[model samples]
Target: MKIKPVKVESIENPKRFLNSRLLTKIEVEEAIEKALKQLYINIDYFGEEYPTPATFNNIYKVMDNTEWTNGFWTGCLWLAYEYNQDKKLKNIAHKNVLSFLNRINNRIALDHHNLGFLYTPSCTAEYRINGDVKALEATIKAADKLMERLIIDCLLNIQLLFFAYEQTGDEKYRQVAVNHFYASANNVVRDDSSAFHTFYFDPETGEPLKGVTRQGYSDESSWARGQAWGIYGIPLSYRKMKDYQQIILFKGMTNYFLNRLPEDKVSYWDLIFTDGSGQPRDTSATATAVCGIHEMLKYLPEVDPDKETYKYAMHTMLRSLIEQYSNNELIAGRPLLLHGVYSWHSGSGVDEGNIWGDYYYLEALIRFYKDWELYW
Candidate 1:
């Protein structure tokens, strides 16, 4: 099978199309409102300790510390704060980011290669939305940290690579970054356009030498995030490349993953693992997957606005995110989302309040709200 990527370029400037302007704006507000209430109430009760973690246990065993996910809960606070300019949210967001310094100043913590996701919302968004120098400094270092870790699973690192390149205009990030993308394109994505989560490649020749895993069931099994990462990660490179074949590859992978999702529009954590008779569902994957779909939608014409086509599917996934997987309990305490699975295979944080899930949920909300202020 020939793997010619699809070029589903945006039909209109995204600024004009607008997400929050949709018919679901009211639901959008309602969702944010419920979360705001949860955050405030939880913060008020917890007072000095009112914040949550990258995630909490089934019983909400949260840390008084920073994991990579530490950025998200506060990051969501910043997003809500941006939407309404609430002073309390601002203070809390500031305080939470301040706490991150202990981790940020420590060099080992920055190695996760996820600083793009880490900083963009809390640190980078804070710096962008405010003139916080500390936040700006942290984000710059985080971006610098990311340049080192551009391994196989580069999620929104595409945003960071492009962002750093655009800012510095130095070729190391852009020159090597786009080459990393080309290698990912030639090697990471499969001939059928089903993406491998990670691969060891011949950097010299861009040939993929082996498939690897940190998140999926195995090197070959379709762990949900790996699949979702492929869905989300590939198109950002496509955004700049605009190669017709890249477009075809984007669409090829897009359809390959979407067609695999279950009817409720979410999937068991790994698509091809076991019979999936009983597996934790990854709402995070669904959210990231939707982000990817919406990006492609910007480029392509809608076949039917209400059917399972791009327009219908993206919003349908959004509605399912709110209806089936979330609630306002965090206002009282237990974190905003429930039943998120961070790593079912590892039993690390299965059926817990994974912070990234909340982040992406609100992200889709905010994305549709007004489109990403910084598509980072």
Candidate 2:
């Protein structure tokens, strides 16, 4: 079966359509009010920290073990802080980090190379905003631990950590991020836009031997999440570096992602390399694209030259999500979207709905409405 490429209409002027606008005090208040209402209904105070279903009914069921889902909890705290200025969110986040502190003890903690989930919203953001010294100290310690995992070939993670360092003004964090960059640039990313998960190091010599595979699609095939990470990660690195050398690499990867994504929406996995015999679409990738698109707008003001392009893309993606996968009829009222594949390699809930998708989808909506100050 031949899947016809979807035709996407290009917009002429994106700036007029997508420029950031300040929110009026009234609008801000209203938005905050809506958010507060949702938080009130969603939070499960007596349950495990960052409880699933995030609702009131399960408030009394305390679960001892929760998967160390880094980004979701981080985003949760940030949202809680954003709307209510709540100290409890900070407290919950602090408690949760203690559970995963052992992740620092491992030599490699490169899950999608996203320290933003690990440190920024979890540690750095809390401390920076609320003057929480303990959180700040924990974040610094996480940075130190992250530096130890650097293999000189894990550039993707390094680059992400570097941005965190810049945001926090921490020099040690900056050094680890840079070191990972130099290593990853040489080993992890390939010229054709595909990337590897791990890098082998000589046990005796303590130097990178070659690229290795962790949990992902084959070496030759482009892993959807890895590609998304690379596409967004490079520019994130560039924001802090500002060097032409880094910008060139960033542009290369960004172009690769844009070119390969099927204009209508990004693929569940690598759209370009999928076997097509039994390919499953991952909505989480689309959520990641939402983040990627917002990040792109931050720097490449010229990409959406007319501004309509960005607007159309944003609307199109959101509409696709709502129309295709959202479980609006679910009586539980779990979320707006569903059927998000968390990981293809593990086949864990391959076609089931996921929390991260819901989180990122909401984040995308928040970004679009808040950054552009657009209603609805």
Candidate 3:
């Protein structure tokens, strides 16, 4: 059964689609709510560290997280609150964000590339939705931190600067975000529309030293998820900046992704296809592609008029994910989406739901429901 979600921002949002067959609104709600419920339960016990790959399974292990991924749990909660207006979920997320006092106090947390991932949903969401000054200030600080790295992840992080810029009217915040946009567009994106997962530049010289495919099959291969990030990120940048280059970069990467899609519409960890000792499908990457592509359909440029191409692809992928890739039978205590590979090179996780994958899956469904508010 299919049901349209709550009324959302735009009139032509994706919630009205009538395609999903098996899972009813009841089932989807149950799954999302259950996932949020478990997220709170699992995270409340997270002593002093943000939940991470190393921390989820070993809750007591106070280890250094990548610090970039610390926002997924809060992001998931924000999505939950946005979808259902669950005041308790919003409050829960606020409490969790406050727990990051250590991150705010430490100098070490300043230069990471994931400030967008860290602050947007966690801090900016609170400020936007509730007029929280503390939240706004916290995110401004994150934008300052992000201004230094200026990496590819800014595809998502730029939104934070937009938030701060529009709210505070500070040209510095907006300019820094736009600078990263230009830097990433010029340097990180490759000729094939694929992007290097990481480009370590001369931080001072602002010159590129080398590009590293940190999470892919090889230094040269297009990482499936990294490509997905570009697909999602470029259009997002285009949305705010309205740059033709951003649109072209988005379409190129999206078309590249479409051309490379496995028959299942889900990714097998990497696009190189032959590199992994254990090649696992990355549903996280697939989820974001669906989320971004669906959004891209709404923002299709006048140059490309065949909106159906993107619409059809987005629906096909979402349906495939729900029917074919989702955890068909629930795994007790685990989130809904499954078979998500986090990092294959170091064997961090394989064939299991990672937090980002799970968050974006719900985010995709929320788009279908028409209740999606931009979280990143």
Q: Would you list the C-alpha lDDT of every candidate in the order shown? A: 0.64, 0.51, 0.66
Model 3, runs deviating above 4 Å: 1-50, 54-66, 108-111, 148-150, 200-213, 274-278, 301-303, 328-333
Q: Which ten-residue region of model 2 has the weakest summed lDDT?
A: 1-10
lDDT of 3: 0.66
TM-score, ranked from best to worst = 1, 3, 2
TM-score versus the correct structure, for each prediction: 0.80, 0.67, 0.80
Model 3: per-residue Cα lDDT over 1-376, one tens digit each: 1111211112132233323243457656655665556555545455334455322332222234345566776777777777778787777778756755346647554444467777786777777678776776777777776655434566787878877778778898878777777777666667666667564567689775653224777868878888788778877777778766565567777777766666666777787663233567777888889888877777786557445566766776776677676654332335446777777776776676676777788788777766566755
Please say which candidate is ahead in lDDT: 2 or 3: 3
The C-alpha local distance difference test score for the whole of candidate 2 amounts to 0.51
Answer with 1 or 2, whichever has the higher lDDT.
Answer: 1
lDDT of 2 by residue, 1-376 (tens): 1111222223333343244343345643543454444444445543334534222221212233233345464565565555566777666666655544444445234453444445554555555556566655655666665565432124334643664465578787877666555556555667654555554466799886653324356656666666556555555565666644554454455445445555345455654543343566566667656565566557664643433454455455555665565554433324335655556665554665555555556555566555431110
**Of models 2 and 3, which has the larger TM-score?**
3
- Candidate 3: clashing pairs of residues: 15-368
List where candidate 2 sits over 4 angstroms from the true fold: 1-42, 51-68, 83-116, 150-156, 159-172, 199-215, 262-264, 273-278, 301-315, 326-336, 371-376
